[PDB]
Curated annotation (Swiss-Prot):
Substrate binds at residues 195-196. This is Carbonic anhydrase 2. Changing residue 61 to W: Impaired activity, rescued by 4-methylimidazole (4-MI). Impaired activity, not rescued by 4-methylimidazole (4-MI). It comes from Homo sapiens (Human). The keyword Cell wall biogenesis/degradation does not apply.
Length: 257
């Protein structure tokens, strides 16, 4: 179907998903010169204390770490959000080289990777229903830069070989996503979309200003996974990012002066 490999990549998606040329597509470039501080924007509330990780799996586009979202165990509230949003999964987008990989950019600058923690609005009952609504999803985006190793990321790295190809899954319990957050929760926010098909415009983006640091060794593990399934012609999972889309009539708001 769709992918990131030139013949089925983002430039082709619109043929199957016309919303690709929509009015609030993601990702976008964050221009700090035009991203205005909004005093009304309140502090984020991330309550990940009792997050319950279930498993990790390679879906052919990235690897997702899935959480138990039956109760309000790992939720995002506050900021620009109206209700309570439950964490369902996180995944990354990364490049073939260190100088590329993030979806969002800051003053056109790219990071080595981008982490997306995906949450859904509890009033819709489940993720399936929420993904269809304009205020259905909230995604926390966190940039990764290469430097010192991130201790909280190592548990994830130490399991990637076991889900190398598409469709592979593995139990992955007792993972604490708090170990992936930066010190500061200062953020920019704007209304956008899923950056992969079906590209629905149901996402409130919250992109953190402060990057986290990961080692060259940890990001190398990412690049060893495969897009392809077991046996098929090997395609290394790299450059699974969508290029920046037009901002059009949206404004990006900043939570900080
Ligand atoms: Zn993503």
């Amino acid at each position: 179907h769709w992918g990131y490999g030139k013949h089925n990549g983002p430039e082709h998606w619109h043929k199957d998903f016309p919303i690709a040329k929509g009015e609030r597509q993601s990702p976008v470039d964050i221009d700090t010169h035009t991203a205005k501080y909004d005093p009304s924007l309140k502090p984020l509330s991330v309550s990940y204390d009792q997050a319950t990780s279930l498993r990790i799996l390679n879906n052919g586009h990235a690897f997702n770490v899935e959480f138990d979202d039956s109760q309000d165990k790992a939720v995002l509230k506050g900021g620009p959000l109206d209700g309570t949003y439950r964490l369902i999964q996180f995944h990354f987008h990364w490049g073939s080289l260190d100088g590329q990989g993030s979806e969002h950019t800051v003053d056109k600058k790219k990071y080595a990777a981008e982490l997306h923690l995906v949450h859904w609005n509890t009033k819709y009952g489940d993720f399936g229903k929420a993904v269809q609504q304009p205020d259905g999803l909230a995604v926390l985006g966190i940039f990764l830069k290469v430097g010192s190793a991130k201790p909280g990321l190592q548990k994830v790295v130490d399991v990637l070989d076991s889900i190398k190809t598409k469709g592979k899954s593995a139990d992955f319990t007792n993972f604490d996503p708090r170990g992936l957050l930066p010190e500061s929760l200062d953020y920019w926010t704007y209304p956008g979309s899923l950056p992969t098909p079906p590209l629905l415009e149901s996402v409130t983006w919250i992109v953190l200003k402060e990057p986290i640091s990961v080692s060259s060794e940890q990001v190398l593990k990412f690049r060893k996974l495969n897009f392809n399934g077991e046996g098929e012609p090997e395609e290394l999972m790299v450059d699974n990012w969508r290029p920046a889309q037009p901002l059009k009539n949206r404004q990006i708001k900043a939570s900080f002066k």
